[PDB]
Amino acid sequence: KLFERCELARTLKRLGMDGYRGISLANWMCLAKWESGYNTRATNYNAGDRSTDYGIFQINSRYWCNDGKTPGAVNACHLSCSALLQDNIADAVACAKRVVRDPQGIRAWVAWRNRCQNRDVRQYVQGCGV
Numbered sequence: 001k002l003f004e005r006c007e008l009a010r011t012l013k014r015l016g017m018d019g020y021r022g023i024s025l026a027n028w029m030c031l032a033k034w035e036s037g038y039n040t041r042a043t044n045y046n047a048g049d050r051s052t053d054y055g056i057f058q059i060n061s062r063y064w065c066n067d068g069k070t071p072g073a074v075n076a077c078h079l080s081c082s083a084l085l086q087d088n089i090a091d092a093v094a095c096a097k098r099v100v101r102d103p104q105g106i107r108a109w110v111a112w113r114n115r116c117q118n119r120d121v122r123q124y125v126q127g128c129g130v
Contacts, residue, residue: 001087003038003056005029006128013130015093023106028096029124030116031109032056040087055084055092057099057109064095 003011009029012018018025035058036042044053051062051070061070065081077095084092099108106112 001040008038009125009128009130020097021100021105025130026121026124027106027116030121031112034111034115040089041085054081056089057092057096059084059095
């Protein structure tokens, strides 16, 4: 599923993401925007290390979900990577929360550093009623 901007904002808000571990909803929106373009079906295989990024947040198989084909990988979210490809983003959100409970927080995703950090991210939630 390809979410529309405000649709996703409210969906994320309902799932308890607004300010989760100090991360504003606009930051989450900026992350999803740059990671998948708000696409829950998005996948990116990393030929370099044999891992794959899954879903709207492009969560990596090396540490967060199990796809059974990533060398010495682990499953921190305790989910099949398949769960990160659902139209319903509840599992992906639970996993995204798990990622940020680690020291780096939102900085875990390099794309967030490149495209969202120290940026005016207000435009992501404007007019969405969140």
